[PDB]
Write a protein that binds this ligand. Structure first.
Ligand SMILES: O=C(NC[C@H](O)CN1CCc2ccccc2C1)c1cccc(-c2ccccn2)c1
Ligand SMILES: Nc1ncnc2c1ncn2[C@@H]1O[C@H](C[C@@H](N)CC[C@H](N)C(=O)O)[C@@H](O)[C@H]1O
Ligand SMILES: Nc1ncnc2c1ncn2[C@@H]1O[C@H](C[C@@H](N)CC[C@H](N)C(=O)O)[C@@H](O)[C@H]1O
Lengths: 313, 303, 322, 322
């Protein structure tokens, strides 16, 4: 409580949903209240990473109307948020960076918005909902440009390509992984390792080779995939529960972080062999974000309200 | 006058939300009893031992309010028919827990989805619950006229929507419901929540639900067209179905966000009320026969 | 064996007597247990067993800041649904003074022993909800000199005449079971159109803690009821009394009934056939409390002035599960 | 849950195969366990679980003076009446080499751990006598590297057609219970006037010892039966196979049936309504094994070519007690 700035609420909701380092080195926090009287969420900026989750030593904070299902930095001051309310919302960070203020809140989805990714230009984003839709947004205009009912069940994860504005991956509980390219008149192409396996639950583009990605499934397996020869290259049984997130290090030879509902973090090399493992969390592991300053530092949040900083050999 | 209800999948505060939807005109609310995103673990350490509460308190409402105003929803992550053993186990327990909680609260009804062909294990767990304790609570199966897979935009390059008409495959959805109620041995406790889409199917695949115990019809906001003066209305063909459903007396459920930000939600609802007002009035027969619909009596033997 | 619904906890929470009687029992016990000069240094560990939605927990707290003494509280409840209410209470209000445990008291491994176990696990015939078995499974974590609340309970029985209730039981025949099961199980009922043929007499007694080398909760009792009108016996009315602490008691025996206490109605034990009784005769009834590891039950018979079938032999028509 | 009568033990003791197969399984295991140079210095501790009137005990002894190895025997039996026979055997014959224990193997406190637990607690559908639960409660006294005999078992199912047996089940309707309970419980029967519609397939498997961190004996299995005549399904036939030791096995699956072995007849799982099956169709059946702390049971359904009611939901018509 030593700090607790204006507009910031006294208490941070127990269920830590997301953690993302800005390029300047500061830590963004999304969190939801998933039990108890009030079902809501809040947004946090921590210029002192080591100080989090302590509400006291934070740079800014704010209550959202509902819980936060996903979020992502938009450039440097922008916070884009996937809501329970069905809304995607933009929160603009202060010019002094001590207030977080609603930029827009658009109620466009019909169920919880579960997933959100920023497209490489930074002027547009794709959101994925339980309403089975995928939506493409103009951030400056505050509008949905395109709506896509490509899937047959709820969408789990949408991931913008690092470098091309019209390409992204989505995956849904209808067993499909769609490779998108909005320039085609039929934008989705179903490209899953096409033996109907286990439902895909998490996606991550390779940051260098703009044409390989990874997907994790509900069974704890992580898989490396080439888009051009589509013969699912590598796979390893990394987890004993669903794999909920996949995050590549900023290294030029990147390591892959992998988080699970088995409450464990793993770090894997480019051929998916296990380098690291952490049981430090005692509830679900929800996100992982690598330090821009120190490249062997990795931060995880969980539903155990732990913000944990890892040193990676 | 219609009896209608709001469907939400997000309730930040139960006290306020209920107020809003009463204010908006609705007779009742469909909401989750646990957070829809709050996946629980039942078997594996550590997550098993997650500190409680598991959900919000019953004290937040009066008994009266619970018995009369709240229809529960199954958490959408619960999948008793997963291919994955562990998920299937957690789902078994999770479903029990949510169901037991509805019973505890004395909810009048409770919604479960049929959104795939195979619901054998869902059926079993429900059948199990139904024969455990004594309660009169209703179970509404949320079944769509048209399967989600058959409503998808034709926008996958390498998986086109199979265009040629199939008499059977446009009925699949009924067979989903058929098998589920056959395995539950036609429990009187299990009824239908028919979900209407923008594409009303072939007239024959609607016929199908003739005779079935439809207790409720679910209208997504998305299917309302707009009149020349910016207000929500329905296509002529959708209007037919409404009059048919009204004849059979069911409850109507509005689901989804506002898509005509011009006015409140109460516009959608007003329109139903509008359609209900605009039925022909009962004939003399229909007035006499009113309380007798589907009520079996012995034939008289005046001899 | 079943989980109480929310509206049930709600109705009975409204009792104007049961709770303040409990408060008082805890308040007297707290004083007897920590002498004045210890008031700030001795902190009593208190366990509620079957906390419900927590009104005994509040009552324990009210007792403590009235005795001006200090307590640690465990709130143990098997009903996961009620446990939801408790855990919202301990987050919103009680704070870490109360520890909520979600388990069966027969199963729970206690981190520490208690000064005082508090419970109300009693039905209209005292032990018909298996309060003996439950507290027997819990007593291994009561300190060697610990107090149980309640300290003891005793059931009672009176013979009655009622053609009206005889008919009600009769009307309880169902398909797919013994055509005479209705008669071999007890009903909770606000007995109204009936006559009491003799004054109630004690039947079964249990004390807590129970420091018997060999514990046996089974029982067999013979009662002898002087009858001084001519009549027909259709049943036995059960009641109970319980000693919470010392002189602080609860009763539904009508001689000593606790004023205002609506929480328990009488129980009715019926008989398959009505029995003629002439003025001057003695009614002799017999009651057994029986059990195995899965369930407990009653069997009973009338042996004077004529005999009747042994009722419920084996708990064929009615058991209470463990 | 019930005590076998003497004449029952007598009939099955006459089996010409079950016992010598057991002897052999113990004999192979004894050799694998004590190397030649240890033969006089290593004395293997052997436990029979469910000794009955003792023929496994004699069989263990016969195995030992055929392997020329030395054994200590515990003979554990819950049936006090059978225990009478055992104790007359150990006084008149076995001497102190055999220790007879009269208790449940789930309850017994073992003075020492075993090299080898031996049992035959199997019914016609393998695990329908609760051999899993029983050996699971006993395994805490099997040495860290101990052998169970048997090592594993697997049940099987085949769909059948029989109007004759459909009628027999029908004829099993009783007063005072569900008019359709006959159909929701399994029968042991020497199936004769019937047709097997598809080849049997594995259903449930259990291994012993079971070193799962979390042990779960519940199950759910889906089978798919290719059918190539037109017919009516009235039931499922169950059989089983068990691995005693290594390659020494027992079977009542007719493909691999153990010659001469009359000890187990097939089980029949019936269905409330017969179901039409056309040549070319698949029969899909589903079986679940369910339980609580008191009892275990099956529920099953047919989901293709048409569905049927879920059978026995809750074990309302049939449980096997713990
Ligand atoms: O058996 C029934 N209906 C067929 C009869 O032949 C109806 N007729 C109609 C003609 C008639 C006229 C005088 C007296 C009796 C009758 C009975 C029947 C049985 C139970 C109830 C009713 C009933 C009772 C009230 C309102 C409508 N229907 C009707
Ligand atoms: N063996 C047990 N372990 C834990 N809780 C139990 C057990 N047996 C009964 N209960 C709970 O004990 C309570 C008994 C109630 N009559 C009292 C509830 C509450 N203290 C009240 O007075 O409102 C119920 O909530 C039961 O669910
Ligand atoms: N949990 C248990 N504890 C002790 N004995 C048991 C238990 N369960 C079953 N039994 C006994 O196991 C035996 C099983 C019999 N099929 C085998 C008997 C004997 N060994 C024989 O083959 O002739 C019966 O005598 C049962 O009474």
């Amino acid at each position: 409580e030593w700090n607790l700035p204006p507009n910031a609420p006294a208490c941070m909701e127990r269920q830590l949903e997301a953690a993302r380092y800005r390029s300047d080195g500061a830590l963004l926090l999304g969190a939801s209240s998933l039990s108890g009287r009030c079902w809501a969420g809040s947004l946090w900026l921590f210029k002192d990473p080591c100080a989090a989750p302590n509400e006291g030593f934070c740079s800014a904070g704010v209550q959202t109307e509902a819980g936060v299902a996903d979020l992502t930095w938009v450039g440097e001051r922008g916070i884009l948020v996937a809501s329970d309310s069905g809304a995607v919302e933009l929160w603009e960070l202060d010019e002094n960076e001590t207030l977080i203020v609603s930029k827009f809140c658009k109620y466009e989805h019909d169920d919880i918005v579960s997933t959100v990714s920023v497209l490489s230009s930074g002027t547009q984003a794709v959101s994925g909902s339980k309403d089975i839709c995928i939506k493409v947004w103009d951030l400056a205009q505050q509008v949905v440009l395109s709506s896509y009912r490509a899937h047959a069940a709820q969408v789990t994860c949408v991931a913008a390509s690092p470098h091309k504005d019209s390409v992204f991956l989505s995956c849904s509980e209808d067993n499909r992984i769609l490779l998108w390219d909005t320039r085609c008149p039929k934008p989705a192409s179903q490209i899953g390792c096409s033996a109907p396996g286990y439902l895909p639950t998490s996606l991550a583009w390779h940051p260098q080779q703009s044409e390989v990605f990874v997907f994790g499934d509900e069974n704890g397996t992580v898989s490396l995939v080439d888009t051009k020869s589509t013969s699912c290259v590598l796979s390893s049984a990394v987890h004993s529960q669903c794999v909920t997130g996949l995050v590549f290090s900023p290294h030029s030879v990147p390591f892959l972080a992998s988080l699970s509902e088995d409450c464990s973090l793993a770090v894997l090399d480019s051929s998916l062999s296990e380098l690291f493992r952490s049981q430090a969390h005692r509830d679900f592991v929800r996100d992982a974000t690598w330090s821009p300053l120190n490249h062997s530092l990795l931060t995880t949040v969980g539903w155990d309200h732990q913000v944990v900083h890892h040193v990676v050999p | 006058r219609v009896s209608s209800g709001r469907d939400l999948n997000c309730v930040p505060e139960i006290a306020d939300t209920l107020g809003a939807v009463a204010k908006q005109g609705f007779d009742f609310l469909c909401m989750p009893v646990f957070h829809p995103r709050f996946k629980r673990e039942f078997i594996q350490e550590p997550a098993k031992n997650r500190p409680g509460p598991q959900t919000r308190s019953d004290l937040l409402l009066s008994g009266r309010d619970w018995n009369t105003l709240i229809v529960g929803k199954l958490s959408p992550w619960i999948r008793p028919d997963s291919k994955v053993e562990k998920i299937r186990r957690n789902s078994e327990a999770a479903m029990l827990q949510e169901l037991n909680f509805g019973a505890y609260l004395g909810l009048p009804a409770f919604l479960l989805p049929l959104n795939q062909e195979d619901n054998t294990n869902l059926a079993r767990v429900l059948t199990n619950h139904i024969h455990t304790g004594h309660h009169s609570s209703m179970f509404w199966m949320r079944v769509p006229l048209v399967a989600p897979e058959d409503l998808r935009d034709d926008i996958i390059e390498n998986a086109p929507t199979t265009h040629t008409e199939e008499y059977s495959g446009e009925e699949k959805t009924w067979m989903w419901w058929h098998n589920f109620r056959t395995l539950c041995d036609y429990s009187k406790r299990i009824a239908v929540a028919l979900e209407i889409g923008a594409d009303l199917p072939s007239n024959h695949v609607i016929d199908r639900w003739l005779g079935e115990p439809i207790k409720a019809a679910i209208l997504p906001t998305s299917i309302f067209l707009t009149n020349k003066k910016g207000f929500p209305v329905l296509s002529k063909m959708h209007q037919r179905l409404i009059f048919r459903l009204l004849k059979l007396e069911v409850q109507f459920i509005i689901t989804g966000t506002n898509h005509h930000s011009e006015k409140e939600f109460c516009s959608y609802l007003q329109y139903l009320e509008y359609l209900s007002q605009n039925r022909p009035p009962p004939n003399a027969y229909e007035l006499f026969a009113k309380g007798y619909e589907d009520y079996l009596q012995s034939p008289l033997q005046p001899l | 064996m079943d989980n109480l619904e929310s509206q049930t906890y709600e109705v009975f929470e409204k009792d104007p007597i049961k709770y303040s009687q409990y408060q008082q029992a805890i308040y007297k016990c707290l004083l007897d247990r920590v002498p004045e000069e210890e008031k700030d240094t001795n902190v009593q560990v208190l366990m509620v067993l079957g906390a419900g939605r927590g009104p005994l927990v509040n009552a324990s707290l009210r007792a403590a800041k009235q005795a001006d003494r200090r307590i640690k509280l465990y709130a143990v409840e098997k009903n996961p649904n009620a446990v939801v209410t408790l855990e919202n209470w301990q987050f919103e209000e009680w704070g870490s003074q109360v520890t909520v445990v979600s388990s069966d008291m027969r199963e729970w491994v206690a981190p520490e022993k208690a000064d005082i176990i508090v419970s109300e696990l009693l039905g209209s015939f005292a032990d018909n909800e298996l309060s003996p078995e439950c507290l027997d499974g819990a007593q291994h974590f009561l300190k060697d000199d610990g107090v149980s609340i309640p300290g003891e309970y005793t059931s009672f029985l009176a013979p009655i005449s009622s053609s009206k209730l005889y008919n009600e039981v009769r009307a309880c025949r169902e398909k797919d079971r013994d055509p005479e099961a209705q008669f071999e199980m007890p009903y909770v009922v606000r007995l109204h159109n009936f006559h009491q043929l003799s004054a109630p007499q004690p039947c079964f007694t249990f004390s807590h803690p129970n420091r018997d080398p060999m514990i046996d909760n089974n029982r067999y009792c013979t009662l002898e009821f002087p009858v001084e009108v001519n009549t027909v016996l259709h049943g036995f009315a059960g009641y109970f009394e319980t000693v919470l602490y010392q002189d602080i008691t609860l009763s539904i025996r009508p001689e000593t009934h606790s004023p205002g206490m609506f929480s328990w109605f009488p129980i009715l034990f019926p008989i398959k056939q009505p029995i003629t009784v002439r003025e001057g005769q003695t009614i002799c009834v017999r009651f057994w409390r029986c059990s195995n590891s899965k369930k407990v039950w009653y069997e009973w018979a009338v042996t004077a002035p004529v005999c009747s079938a042994i009722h419920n032999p084996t708990g064929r028509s009615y058991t209470i599960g463990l």
